[PDB]
Amino acid sequence: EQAPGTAPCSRGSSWSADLDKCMDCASCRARPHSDFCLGCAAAPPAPFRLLWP
Structure with a gap:
């Protein structure tokens, strides 16, 4: 129960x-090792079509 953070899924977050x-x-934000990270990463949103980096 007691932990530095970890909320009951509120505003954003991601399921696991x-x-x-x-x-x-x-x-x-640096150590990829969780299922909930797969939902957050990969940029959920996306431009209109594409850009030229």
Whole structure:
């Protein structure tokens, strides 16, 4: 129960099937090791068509 953060899925966040549990996105900005990260990463949104980096 007690943990530095971890909220009950509120505003954004991402679900996790690996262990059936929700988890915010404030714990995967460098260390990719969680199912909930797959939902947050990969940029959910997208431009109109495409851009030229």
